[PDB]
Swiss-Prot record, chain A:
Name of the protein in question: Transient receptor potential cation channel subfamily V member 1
Leftover remarks: Responses evoked by capsaicin, but not by low pH and heat, can be antagonized by capsazepine.
Entry remark concerning the domains of this protein: The association domain (AD) is necessary for self-association.
Record PTM: Phosphorylation by PKA reverses capsaicin-induced dephosphorylation at multiple sites, probably including Ser-6 as a major phosphorylation site. Phosphorylation by CAMKII seems to regulate binding to vanilloids. Phosphorylated and modulated by PRKCE, PRKCM and probably PRKCZ. Dephosphorylation by calcineurin seems to lead to receptor desensitization and phosphorylation by CAMKII recovers activity.
PTM sites of type Phosphoserine: 6
Phosphothreonine found at: 34
Binding, ATP: 5, 45, 50, 54, 89-92, 100-101
Record note on what altering residue 89 to A does: Strongly reduces affinity for ATP
Superkingdom classification of source: Eukaryota
ANK repeats: 1-28, 43-75, 93-118
Oligomeric and partner information: Homotetramer. Interacts with PIRT. May also form a heteromeric channel with TRPV3. Interacts with CALM, PRKCM and CSK. Interacts with PRKCG and NTRK1, probably by forming a trimeric complex. Interacts with the Scolopendra mutilans RhTx toxin. Interacts with the spider Tau-theraphotoxin-Hs1a. Interacts with TMEM100. Interacts with PACS2.
Tissue: Predominantly expressed in trigeminal and dorsal root sensory ganglia. Expressed also in hippocampus, cortex, cerebellum, olfactory bulb, mesencephalon and hindbrain. High expression in the cell bodies and dendrites of neurons in the hippocampus and in the cortex. In the brain detected also in astrocytes and pericytes (at protein level). Isoform 1 and isoform 3 are expressed in brain and peripheral blood mononuclear cells.
Stated family: Belongs to the transient receptor (TC 1.A.4) family. TrpV subfamily. TRPV1 sub-subfamily.
Length: 150, 148
């Protein structure tokens, strides 16, 4: 069995083992990696997104496994494309983060598993400082990738 | 911060200026005024005080030149004046502007932070001098420079 907490901890330390029994779990319960219960109820963060924050050397293969699991249930598209819902990071997707981190490899990977390239990150974190701040590029992956000189 | 700069400068000049300058002007005016009192026998311009006051007006912009008819030796008193009038307001004035100009090469730029100190002291005191009433007591600055 797996609750939200269980996976998020596994992800935090790049553990691909504690997620050995993962796929077969939501096969029995037919639960989806995308269920309401597998996201933070106030931000909309998913395990993939936790993984995106918990990088070590711009690397995490909990990602590769996490994606793999989502296709086997074909949560695939809406999984890779889930966005933040809090006023701060609203509309931020994993692809936004990969770029923010200047990580070709993870941009490449996300685009190949079908990240929406037109997804607008539009929360207060992506507009001019309250100061909050900060910082605006606006919104769309291309725009980001240019404004950060990439 | 516009008003403040103006406020600081006047106070600084006043502290600097009177000792270096108020005294020197007093000496030039004192000497010449004494020279004049000796010069005049009668008519109330004999008094050091009346004569000195008459001598001051030259500096104000109200100078009367040869105000007094009374006295002896004719024009020498006028030459005595022309020098003092030429000598003190005017010889004295040029060097006085010049030092400020030389600083005004500089301090004006250094100073503005000087006001900054004044606000800090006023603020620090009110809270301390505000009864140490409940008041804030985390700092962070929103930042965004790349550098990326």
């Amino acid at each position: 069995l797996y609750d939200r907490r269980s996976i998020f901890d596994a992800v935090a330390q790049s553990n691909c083992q504690e997620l050995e029994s993962l796929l077969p779990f939501l096969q029995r319960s037919k639960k989806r990696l995308t269920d309401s219960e597998f996201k933070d109820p106030e931000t909309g963060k998913t395990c993939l997104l936790k993984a995106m924050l918990n990088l070590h050397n711009g690397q995490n293969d909990t990602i590769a496994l996490l994606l793999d699991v989502a296709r086997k249930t074909d949560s695939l598209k809406q999984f890779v494309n889930a966005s933040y819902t809090d006023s701060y990071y609203k509309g931020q997707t994993a692809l936004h983060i990969a770029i923010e981190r200047r990580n070709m490899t993870l941009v490449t990977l996300l685009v190949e598993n079908g990240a929406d390239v037109q997804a607008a990150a539009n929360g207060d974190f992506f507009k001019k400082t309250k100061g909050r701040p900060g910082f605006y590029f606006g919104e769309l992956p291309l725009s980001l990738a240019a404004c950060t000189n990439q | 911060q516009q008003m403040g700069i103006y406020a600081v400068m006047i106070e600084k000049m006043i502290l600097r200026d009177l000792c270096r300058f108020m005294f020197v002007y007093l000496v030039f005016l004192f000497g010449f005024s004494t020279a004049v009192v000796t010069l005049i026998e009668d008519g109330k311009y004999n008094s050091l005080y009346s004569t000195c006051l008459e001598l001051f007006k030259f500096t104000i912009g109200m100078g009367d030149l040869e105000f007094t008819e009374n006295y002896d030796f004719k024009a020498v008193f006028i030459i005595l004046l022309l020098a003092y009038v030429i000598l003190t307001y005017i010889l004295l004035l040029n060097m006085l502007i010049a030092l400020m100009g030389e600083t005004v090469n500089k301090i004006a730029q250094e100073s503005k932070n000087i006001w900054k100190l004044q606000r800090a002291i006023t603020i620090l005191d009110t809270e301390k001098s505000f009864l140490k009433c409940m008041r804030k007591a985390x700092x962070x600055x929103x930042x965004x420079x790349x550098x990326x």
